[PDB]
Structure 1
Amino acid sequence: VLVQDLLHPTAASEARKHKLKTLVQGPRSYFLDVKCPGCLNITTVFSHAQTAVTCESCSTILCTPTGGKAKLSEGTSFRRK
């Protein structure tokens, strides 16, 4: 305080800050890849997705929406990006 590097704040305090309050703003949301074991098909779902997602067929489920990150349903695998 009274002198500091604003151009290079630490990545520890830039991560705890609010979404819009980062030195340049950017999203905190990610995307997933998900399969249920019954189909080999891969479906890519958005972390906060508002739509209850199904894979290409079979209307199992994938996620259910909430006020936060969508809730992935039961046994499923999810990678990042």
Structure 2
Amino acid sequence: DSDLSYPTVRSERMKHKRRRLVQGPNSYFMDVKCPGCNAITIVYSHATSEVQCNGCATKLCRPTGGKAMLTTGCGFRKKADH
């Protein structure tokens, strides 16, 4: 059990992102809608800035932490990785 050329789920998913056999990212993109307009802006999950709503300006996120955190009352769908 647990061949090292063909691991399970468990024996990958834990590990730090460079210590897989793949060395993928760890992040994704999203779409976000504001109450004050009809738009979709496309925003980065670990944004690390304040981003002004596409065509509006009010800030859809705060840059805080190692993962950025959406401004309140703004709805958010996710997107694929593919």
**Shared fold per TM-score greater than 0.5:** yes
Identity across aligned pairs (percent)?
59
TM-score by structure 2 length?
Answer: 0.85
Structure 2 residue identity aligned to 1:52: E
Structure 2 residue identity aligned to 1:9: P
Which runs of 5 or more residues in structure 2 are unaligned?
Answer: none
Higher helix residue share: 1
Structure 2 residue identity aligned to 1:56: N
Secondary structure in 2 matching 1:20: coil
CA RMSD of aligned residues (A): 1.4
Higher strand residue share: 2
Which runs of 5 or more residues in structure 1 are unaligned?
Answer: none
Matched with 2:43 is 45
Q: State the aligned residue count.
A: 79
Residue 21 of structure 1: CA displacement? Answer: 0.6
TM-score by structure 1 length?
Answer: 0.86
